[PDB]
Amino acid sequence: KLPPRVPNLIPYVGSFVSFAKNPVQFIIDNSKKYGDVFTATILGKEMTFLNHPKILDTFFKATDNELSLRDVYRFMRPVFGTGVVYDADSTERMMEQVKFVSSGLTTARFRVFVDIFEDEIAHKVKELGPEGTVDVAELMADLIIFTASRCLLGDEVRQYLSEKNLGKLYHDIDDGISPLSFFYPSLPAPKRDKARKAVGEIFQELLDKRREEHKKHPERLLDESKMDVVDHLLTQKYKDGQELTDVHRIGILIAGLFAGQHTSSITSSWTLMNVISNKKVLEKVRKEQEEIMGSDKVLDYDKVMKMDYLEACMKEALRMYPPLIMIMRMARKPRECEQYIIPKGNILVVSPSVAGRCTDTYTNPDVFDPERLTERKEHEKFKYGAVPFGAGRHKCIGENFALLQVKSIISILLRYFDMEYIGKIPDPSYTSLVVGPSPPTRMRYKLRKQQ
Ligand code: HEM
Ligand SMILES: O=C(O[C@H](Cn1ccnc1)c1ccc(F)cc1)c1cccc(C(F)(F)F)c1
Ligand SMILES: [Ca+2]
Ligand SMILES: [Ca+2]
């Protein structure tokens, strides 16, 4: 009736050691032994892993008082803020907060975002010069610090990045966020907290400055192309009529930036590496770019919307290396799954990493092959065969922005540079909450138009 159990190495600690070594491998290996659904004790928590696409409907379609996100992701509170997101008072409030971020991700904004990407890359090529080598992961992270910040927060953020070290503060917050916090939400992190307080004061200042810029220039509020998330946060209230606190606005912006940065810079790195290392894929990608660009010299939104093959490359990098390797929920009530009952209080776990390598969905899954998606449609074999952006009620609302961001960056970089990857494509490093490539990730580059 209860699922089969991974027997423990030890009491309490349970299966932590082999989970911690490689959680993707742990789920695959134990799926073989115990099947589609099994339970492991891990640092005191009962974690029930759901391991096949076919059984996932009841996970994704549940409501929040059956499968709770707030119960598992509340540990983010020292980063995102008290009363924000997974520490909101209710599901309903969290959902309204999400809608404030999504309201800055409009079509009108997306046309302006493409210019932001052009402008930031143009600054960055001054650092890279006409040739050299660079770490792919760092390049992407550094570009996306600037692009995400300006997209979500407005161009007024830029001078804080260039003159007040805001990008270093982001790294200190991000250095302090540990997967083990999920198990111990009180692990102190004094450096993290100091930087979070510092980011708070900067964003408070930015909110204050914007209120006076709204007084002095009220027509800004009538221009859908100039309205960002800070603007919406300052001018909207909750449905029931309660106004937002500056605490909340700050927390929401910080969570917005967290979501707008990590997953995108990781996916860009894996996408670009696999594109430049595969001659056939690079040819197709460049032939699509040349066809879409024609005689124009800069991107725009409509162009990025036609870049289908490159989008398939990004999707194929998301199958193979999803930056969010595990999706969780707590069972607030018992749950049926196949023939089993999953107890109240268990954590249900679905893994986009395991799904992406499932040989029942994908043929030769260790190979990067975007045609598996465009021509073989392998993803469409199960409803939940591809879940890098999740599914159902909590499906990623940043998806179109992330597509826009990564396609644009890669398109622009391929315009400026020939690029070759150094060495073998690395494995994922399971050292961080958002999972990325094991360093080093270096490439050579050379400008295509020298003078
Ligand atoms: C390639 C980039 C990205 C990936 C792979 C990604 C992945 C995911 C996944 C897997 C989920 C489902 C989580 C769950 O069910 O618990 C999700 C939800 C979400 N993502 Fe993303 N995301 C990306 C970019 C973004 C961006 C750029 C934003 C916002 C600017 C964003 C905002 C969200 C939000 C708000 C949710 C909803 C979570 C909830 O309802 O509790 N994401 N994303
Ligand atoms: O950053 C967020 O979630 C990340 C996962 N993620 C990134 C991109 N798409 C989803 C997250 C979720 C749970 C957790 F424990 C740590 C980080 C996030 C989630 C809900 C709402 C928001 C928002 F809208 F910014 F307030 C951000
Ligand atoms: Ca173990
Ligand atoms: Ca799974």
Numbering used by the authors: 35 to 485
What's in the article?
We used a combination of cheminformatics, target-, and phenotypic-based drug discovery methods to identify inhibitors that target an essential N. fowleri enzyme, sterol 14-demethylase (NfCYP51). The amoebicidal effect of CYP51 inhibitors is due to inhibition of 14-demethylation of the endogenous CYP51 substrate in N. fowleri, 31-norlanosterol. 14-Demethylation of 31-norlanosterol is a prerequisite for subsequent 4α-demethylation and 24-methylation steps, leading to biosynthesis of essential ergosterol and ergosterol-like sterols. Depletion of ergosterol, concomitant with the accumulation of intermediates and end-products incompatible with normal permeability and fluidity of the Naegleria cell membrane, leads to the altered morphology and death of N. fowleri cells.
The top hit (2a) had a miconazole-like scaffold (1) and was singled out following cocrystallization with the NfCYP51 target. Only one compound, 2a (used as a racemic mixture), produced cocrystals with the target. The well-defined electron density in the binding pocket adjacent to heme corresponds to the S-configuration at the chiral carbon center of 2a. Superimposition with fluconazole indicates that both molecules coordinate to the heme iron with the azole moiety, while other aromatic moieties of each compound are engaged in different sets of drug–target interactions. The cocrystal structure of 2a revealed three main groups of drug–target interactions. The aromatic nitrogen atom of the imidazole moiety provided a coordination bond to the heme iron. (b) The 3-trifluoromethyl-benzoyl moiety is somewhat coplanar to the heme plane. (c) Finally, the 4-fluorophenyl moiety projects toward the long hydrophobic tunnel extending from the heme to the protein surface known to accommodate large hydrophobic moieties in higher molecular weight azole inhibitors (posaconazole and itraconazole). The C2–C3 edge of the 4-fluorophenyl moiety faces heme propionate (6.3 Å) and the OH-groups of Tyr107 (5.3 Å) and Tyr120. For CNS compatibility, we propose staying within the binding envelope of 2a and avoiding extending molecules into the hydrophobic tunnel.
